């Protein structure tokens, strides 16, 4: 049983995009950052819903000592697609990309075809000043761009209320190339013996202020208010009195009209598909189709096809192409001969009755 109340994310969720040192610079980056003031879903605990994973997820949680162990990612959470597990015990970590069966609670029941077992220092660092009031708050960021699972973290017993307002960067911990496919996310709980803050990252542009030792003192969102773009167009944090031309504005179009004088432009497709005396294969009637608009829905409704294979063009893409000429050779033939008729084939029909050239740009239609 858990709640789904709503809180304000404030200014939070800024990490180091790269591994390059800067000092007293105002570098501007474009990447997936959690936006500025916005709504995050605050959960409780006392069942463990499977939140979606897209373009990364920002995770935050405050706790006394430990109630949350790890995370599970991947698709279908079963023994059919590869998955993840980052469960953390009291001493080490258990990063592994495998094909666990399912647990419903000793967290997996299958490791048949999987590799990439990883172990390192524990992520959760907890310190107390001889008292439990130092509620350790942990902020984690995960993303899966071009594989290469990145994890960022920053551990500090902040004031202790909840999702705070003070700025705090995130230092990377691990970077391992799993890169399978991630669409879901779930969090494991304790076993036996006020958290769960979740935010979603979006592609934005940020201006980050650097200290002289290489830390990030502050940042400015580029799309929050009418301001915060003035500070970006002449990149700085102090703008003098005056008027600045920042960008331009444009209205978007709403509808689309396709008015035409006339557009039936009837093709003989009906006259070739509604015939009653389709000639034999030995004398295949060849009909020339020109000066008409080829709508393939009229071919779609007239015949319940059994073989609509196409070679030079896509069966889905036929109404978006213009053809100089179209030839429709029609002949009734046996069943196996339907599969016989194809470019680069052989047989009593492909050799003596009708031979399809290897460079054939068109489609064939067979209906019983």
């Amino acid at each position, epitope marked *: 049983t858990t709640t*789904q109340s709503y809180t304000n994310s404030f200014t939070r969720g800024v990490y180091y995009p790269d591994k390059v040192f800067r000092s007293s610079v105002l570098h501007l980056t474009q990447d997936l950052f959690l936006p500025f003031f916005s*709504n995050v*879903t605050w959960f409780h605990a006392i069942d463990n819903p499977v*939140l*979606p*994973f*897209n373009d990364g997820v920002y995770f935050a949680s405050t706790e006394k000592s430990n109630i949350i162990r790890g995370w599970i990612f991947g*698709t*279908t959470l*079963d023994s*059919k697609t590869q998955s993840l597990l980052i469960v953390n015990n009291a001493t080490n970590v258990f990063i592994k990309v495998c094909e666990f069966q399912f647990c419903n609670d000793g967290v997996y029941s299958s490791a048949n075809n999987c590799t990439f077992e990883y172990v390192s220092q524990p992520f959760l660092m907890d310190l107390e000043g001889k008292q439990g009031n130092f509620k350790n708050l942990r902020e984690f960021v995960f993303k899966n761009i071009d594989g290469y699972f990145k994890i960022y973290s920053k551990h500090t017993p902040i004031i202790g209320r909840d999702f705070p307002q003070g700025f705090s960067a995130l230092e990377p911990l691990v970077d391992l190339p799993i890169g399978i496919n991630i*669409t*879901r996310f779930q969090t494991l709980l304790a076993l036996n013996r006020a958290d769960y803050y979740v935010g*979603y990252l*979006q592609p934005r542009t940020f201006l980050l202020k650097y200290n002289e030792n290489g830390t990030i003192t502050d940042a400015v969102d580029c799309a929050l208010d009418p301001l915060s773009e003035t500070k970006c167009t002449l990149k700085s944090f102090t703008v003098e009195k005056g008027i600045y031309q920042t960008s331009n504005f444009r209205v978007q179009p*709403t*509808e*689309s009209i*396709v008015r035409f004088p006339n557009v039936t432009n009837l093709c003989p497709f009906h006259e070739v598909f509604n015939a009653t005396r389709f000639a034999s294969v030995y004398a295949w009637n060849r009909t020339r189709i020109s000066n008409c608009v080829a709508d393939y829905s009229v071919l779609y409704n007239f015949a319940p096809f059994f073989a609509f294979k196409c070679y030079g063009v896509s069966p*889905t893409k036929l109404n978006d192409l213009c053809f100089t000429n179209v030839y429709a050779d029609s002949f009734v033939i046996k069943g196996n001969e339907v599969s016989q008729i194809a470019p680069g084939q052989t047989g009593n029909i492909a050799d003596y009755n009708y031979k399809l050239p290897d460079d054939f740009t068109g489609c064939v239609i067979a209906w019983n």
Partner: antibody
Framework: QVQLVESGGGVVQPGRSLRLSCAASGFPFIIYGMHWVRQAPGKGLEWVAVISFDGRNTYYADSVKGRFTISRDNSKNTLYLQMNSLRAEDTAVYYC???????????????WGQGTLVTVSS | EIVMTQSPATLSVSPGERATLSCRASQSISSNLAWYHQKPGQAPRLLIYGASTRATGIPARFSGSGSGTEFTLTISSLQSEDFAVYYCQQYNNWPPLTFGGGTKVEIK
């Protein structure tokens, strides 16, 4: 409990416009995509439109492409569907369906609304 | 576009026995298919996702099997709330979304 209630349907003349709404409550609406699905009488279900969790990604069915507009408002937990140039075949009942990520971005319609009827006639 | 054909257009069985439904795909979809329950006048309910996995809160009497293009849906014991229209939906080809014709299950 999750509730999806549709509204705004009714009778309309050919060539006019109508706007539908689907209010959402009881779940974290801002982190899921939604779907509009219509069912003509005597026919099966037909997929119409889709909008992502923020709004940048939208897709349309080939039968309604260029005429139907889908949008959402996260601040009010409502979903909209603007319709323009309504023809005869657009008479059906429209359902707003929650999406649950599976294999791809959104493939399962988990909760369905009660739906509203739209009919077009002279 | 992958077209989705319902082998049984309409099925008639008395309560108690087993009903078998079949849905076919034009191209290979692996095990990506879903079933929906739909009583006259109500909103669709999800039954089976992944062609082999039962949805939450659904009795075990529902089961399905099959992969590729041939799929089956099996109900061991039909009950008073099972006579409805069943739809099979593909989601392997994500860009478009297709549905089956639907099977009507009715009391004999």
């Amino acid at each position: 409990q999750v509730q999806l209630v549709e509204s705004g349907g009714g009778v309309v003349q050919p060539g006019r416009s109508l706007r539908l709404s689907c209010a959402a409550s009881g779940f974290p609406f801002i982190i899921y995509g939604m779907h509009w699905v219509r069912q003509a009488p005597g026919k099966g279900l037909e997929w119409v439109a889709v909008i992502s969790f923020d709004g940048r990604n939208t897709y349309y069915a080939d039968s309604v492409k260029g005429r139907f507009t889908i949008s959402r408002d996260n601040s009010k937990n409502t979903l909209y569907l603007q319709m323009n140039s309504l023809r005869a075949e657009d008479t059906a009942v429209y359902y707003c369906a929650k999406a649950e990520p599976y294999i791809s971005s959104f493939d399962l319609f988990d909760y369905w609304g009660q739906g509203t009827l739209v009919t077009v006639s002279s | 576009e992958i077209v989705m054909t319902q082998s049984p257009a309409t099925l008639s069985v008395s309560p108690g026995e087993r009903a078998t439904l079949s849905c076919r795909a034009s191209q290979s979809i692996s095990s990506n298919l879903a079933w929906y329950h739909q009583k006259p006048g109500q909103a669709p309910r999800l039954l089976i996702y992944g062609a082999s996995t039962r949805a939450t809160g659904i009795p075990a009497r529902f089961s399905g099997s099959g992969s590729g293009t041939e799929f089956t849906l099996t109900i061991s014991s039909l009950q008073s709330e099972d006579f409805a229209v069943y739809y099979c939906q593909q989601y392997n080809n994500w860009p478009p979304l297709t549905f089956g014709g639907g099977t009507k299950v009715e009391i004999k």
